[PDB]
Design a protein around this ligand. Structure first.
Ligand SMILES: O=C(Cc1cccc(OCCCC2CCNCC2)c1)Nc1nc(-c2ccncc2)cs1
Ligand SMILES: O=C(Cc1cccc(OCCCC2CCNCC2)c1)Nc1nc(-c2ccncc2)cs1
Lengths: 394, 394
């Protein structure tokens, strides 16, 4: 019909999950103008005339749309090779956020684009108290930006380094991780790299997962086919570690192995397969049946030992193969302080004591430009559609 | 300005029919990018290849849903040129009758003339004047630009002049309507530059509407224009064969003088057997303008023709429209300037149906395939000068 065709097209321009909504379309033109504005390419009159025709408009678009200079950077709270995380304050609204920057230069050098899409989607559409929320996502010729709610309580690496974690605390954090991973699993994703580094704490001391650079969408059978290993040397499961491509098929039960590693780390003070070298840590994971031991210190309960061992086994007999309820029913979680359904409403073991909205006390104290192209290379093309601003879900 | 003001201003820009970044122009941007990149040579670049694969399914849906040529049933070809053709069409769904002007993108690129259609698009789309042919929709594909307009069944002034020895009372009516029509264009900030009977169409009532605005240009701050067949063109526009000339709206008044002369004499005043000879006669208008010894032309009609067919510095219309309107030639008892389009026209067309083309000459057949652009080895951007041409009325 004539109206239908018009209405279907109109919904596409408005839909926050559409590849052709206003956000993606503005990204398309912004990328085209960046990728063409070079003296060598401007020798072509089609390119030159187009850029001149859109000059004034592109400057208005770039001024009106969300940009880095709208944010006042308070402190850098995270740093990696692919980018940095910074505590920012939006100059207009005066609102405090955490902003994750990802280097487009770094992503182009090495075939490592495409990882940020699931991190964008999980944070933008999870609508879960267990997942850090994405408020805005934007970009320029140099970086990808993700404006998120700030987690002032810091991460679990910081907590474990400042406290000898008692079992009652370890039960709380393990239980919240179990609920958090289950929310991710329900969305159809496998985390693949669950670690204390990506377990953040809010102003109340309750957990939220962040850093989803390894998340992969499950298939019909709830599986993932991956030829190359993904994760961290200490927390990687044997099945993800040995994945060759010819036989590299695995499910959500790989995230349950990581919980086992996390619980062990909290109660013992070290990872179970730790070695003086990375290659030795690999050897110990592969030989988990003989390398998993507990120190001769009665501090770890029978139930905590049982859970660690129930998780730190081959995927075919691992606790969680039959679902979350078999994990939830484990005697380790038996207590009189909380219940699974009301856990995030209870008072957390460590309630952060914060001086202001820009307090960074739980965070440790802390550019290569693209060469001028001679021909069209389209370095901005793999980032088209990243913007989450003009068409958001409310 | 606030964050909300910035967000809304951006939102209005995506919706505004006069905006260069509304949904129609942004969809054009992506459609052009996909056409210009989808070639085996360019697809060797992974940035280009991955982008096209990512937007494959989405672009096929967009192309199917958006307005296209196959939505229109071509009844008859009513106009033809080197740059394209005009055809009486019927929208297959709505069953509505329109005139559709097609412009060859290959011809526009080849001839290095691909920027003249903007003023024609804008005038017809936004004039909202009973003197300007209305643009209902404007769309495009990799081959043509399309302009879906209100059909003028009464034909043009070339057809009228060829079938009648125009009496002075009719010539007064058509000259007066042309004066009002050009004034509406002038008020919008445009100079026609090539006003001729070919441009002057008649509606179902026999009232004039201007069309074919391929020579139109937007006036500057001082109401001036600079630019780089001559029969109806003024000396100033002809003297500007390289940008060495600044002229105003008074060049359109000269053409009215040429039109009035043509109607009453039967020939253009500066006609010659060759184009170059017509040019020579226009430049020597002071000596070449003569009237035949047939006493038929009135003192007042001769005065107007001469008042218009002079050097721009002493031309009637240099001080505005009111000096033209007050000319004794227009003194009559049939109509008034303010109520002219409400009076009964000298020739009221007698039409058999909504698809009647009796006032349009039958054109010599032209059919087949090909006449397309070669496969590029590098990015050439042949679709770039046409981005933002799409327009849809509400
Ligand atoms: O993201 C990081 C750590 C980080 C820092 C800088 C760059 C990063 O990119 C590296 C990944 C690239 C991989 C992709 C797969 N292939 C291998 C390379 C990651 N930390 C976070 N902090 C928060 C947060 C949210 C609210 N409040 C506070 C902090 C949310 S995520
Ligand atoms: O446009 C034409 C005539 C025509 C036919 C075919 C192609 C044309 O393009 C050639 C000009 C391009 C030039 C520009 C300057 N640089 C050099 C290239 C023009 N006739 C019209 N008819 C209508 C109408 C509207 C309602 N009902 C019926 C007819 C409205 S415009």
């Amino acid at each position: 019909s004539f109206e239908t065709r018009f209405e279907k097209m109109d919904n596409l321009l408005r839909d926050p999950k559409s590849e052709v909504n206003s956000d993606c379309l503005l990204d398309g033109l912004d990328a085209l103008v960046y990728d063409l504005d070079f003296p060598a390419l401007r020798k072509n009159k089609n390119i030159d005339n187009f850029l001149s025709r859109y000059k004034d408009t592109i400057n208005k678009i770039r001024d009106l749309r969300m940009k880095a200079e709208d944010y006042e950077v308070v402190k850098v709270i995270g740093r990696g090779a692919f980018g940095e995380v910074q505590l920012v304050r939006h100059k207009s609204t005066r609102k405090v956020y955490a902003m994750k920057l990802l280097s487009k230069f770094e992503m182009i050098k090495r075939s490592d684009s495409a990882f940020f899409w699931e991190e964008r989607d999980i944070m933008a559409f999870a609508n879960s108290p267990w997942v850090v929320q994405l408020f805005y996502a934007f970009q320029d010729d140099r970086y990808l930006y993700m404006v998120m709610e700030y987690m002032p309580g810091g991460d679990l690496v910081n907590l474990m380094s400042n406290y000898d974690v008692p079992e009652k605390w370890a039960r709380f954090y393990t239980a919240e991780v179990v609920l958090a991973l289950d929310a991710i699993h329900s969305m159809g994703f496998i985390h693949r790299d669950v670690k204390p580094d990506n377990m953040l704490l809010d102003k109340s001391g309750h957990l939220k997962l962040a850093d989803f650079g390894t998340c992969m969408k499950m298939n019909k059978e709830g599986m993932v086919r991956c030829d190359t290993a993904v994760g961290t040397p200490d927390y990687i499961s044997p099945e993800v570690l040995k994945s060759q491509g010819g036989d590299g098929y695995y499910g959500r039960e790989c995230d349950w192995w990581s919980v086992g590693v996390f619980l062990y780390e909290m109660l013992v003070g070290d990872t179970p397969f730790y070695a003086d070298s990375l290659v030795g840590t690999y050897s110990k994971i592969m030989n988990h049946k003989n390398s998993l031991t507990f120190p001769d210190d009665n501090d770890i309960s029978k139930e905590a030992k049982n859970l660690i061992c129930a998780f730190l086994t081959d995927r075919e007999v691992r606790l969680g193969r039959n679902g979350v309820e078999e994990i939830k029913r484990h005697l380790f979680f038996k207590n009189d302080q909380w219940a699974w359904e009301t856990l995030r409403d209870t008072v957390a073991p460590v309630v952060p004591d914060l001086s202001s909205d820009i307090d960074t006390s739980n965070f440790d104290d802390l550019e290569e430009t693209f060469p001028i192209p001679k021909a069209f290379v389209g370095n901005q093309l793999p980032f088209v559609g990243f913007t989450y601003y003009s068409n958001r879900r409310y």
